[PDB]
């Protein structure tokens, strides 16, 4: 799809058998999802945003289907106010900015 930006570029993702809406976020290096039951091991990590940081759980090699594109990558889980699909996954679905 081509997505204009008059609205937040939200997409429906499937991860860990759960459906979520997430923001395609070109300003996000990484993918950060709200608290969710993911299976498996993790590593503590911190991400920085506007104003603050947040501690997150880093899960490697997690399957995610982003708007019907299955990808597998690192997913951060923590107290983010939005599910964010970062460049780490957007590259895997071949997502470009165009103007």
Ligand X SMILES: CC(C)[C@H](NC(=O)[C@H](C)NC(=O)OCc1ccccc1)C(=O)N[C@@H](Cc1ccccc1)[C@@H](O)[C@H](O)[C@H](Cc1ccccc1)NC(=O)[C@@H](NC(=O)[C@H](C)NC(=O)OCc1ccccc1)C(C)C
Write 8-16 long-range contacts (CB < 8 A, 24+): 11/66, 11/67, 11/85, 12/67, 13/64, 13/65, 13/66, 13/67, 13/83, 13/85, 14/64, 14/65, 15/62, 15/63, 15/64, 15/65, 15/75, 16/62
Contact status: 78 vs ligand X (CB under 6 A):
no
Min dist CB 76 to ligand X, Å, is 7
Told to check if 80 binds its own copies by CB under 8 A, we report yes
Please tell me whether residue 30 binds ligand X under the rule CB under 6 A.
yes
CB nearer to ligand X: give 25 or 90.
Answer: 25
Q: Give catalytic residues, as residue numbers.
A: 25
């Amino acid at each position: 799809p081509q997505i204009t930006l008059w609205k937040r570029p939200l997409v429906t993702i499937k991860i860990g058998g759960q459906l979520k809406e997430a923001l395609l976020d070109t300003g996000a290096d990484d993918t950060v999802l709200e608290e969710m039951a993911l299976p498996g091991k993790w590593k503590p990590r911190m991400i920085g945003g506007i104003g603050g940081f947040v501690k997150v759980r880093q899960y490697d090699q997690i399957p995610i289907e982003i708007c019907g594109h299955k990808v597998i990558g690192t997913v951060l889980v923590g107290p983010t106010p939005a599910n964010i699909i970062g460049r780490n996954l957007m590259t895997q679905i071949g997502c470009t900015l165009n103007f």
